[PDB]
Amino acid sequence: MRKRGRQTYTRYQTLELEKEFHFNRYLTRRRRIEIAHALSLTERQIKIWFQNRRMKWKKENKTKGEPG
DNA sequence: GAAAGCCATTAGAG
DNA sequence: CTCTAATGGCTTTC
């Protein structure tokens, strides 16, 4: 596993997860669980992948006005 | 009441 | 050294 041996997040997971993210960064809490089973990850990881994406996405996704 | 939500930082692999 | 994956306190929460 030459990429985050820990946890390689594979394409297929990253496919639909992107599509979800596009619609809804925020999940009402226990929707996260429903994803977690659907893709065979842990609740944790369905926070994290999205959190991680959000964090950067804020800087990236045409955020003028943003103090600074 | 423990959970996502916020975020830079903090391990963590490349 | 670079981008990612994951940690905590504060806040609401159903």
From Swiss-Prot:
Residues 2-61 bind DNA. It comes from the Eukaryota. It is found in: Nucleus. Sequence-specific transcription factor which is part of a developmental regulatory system that regulates segmental identity in the mesothorax. Provides cells with specific positional identities on the anterior-posterior axis. Belongs to the Antp homeobox family. This is Homeotic protein antennapedia. The chain holds residues 313 to 379 of 394 of the full protein.
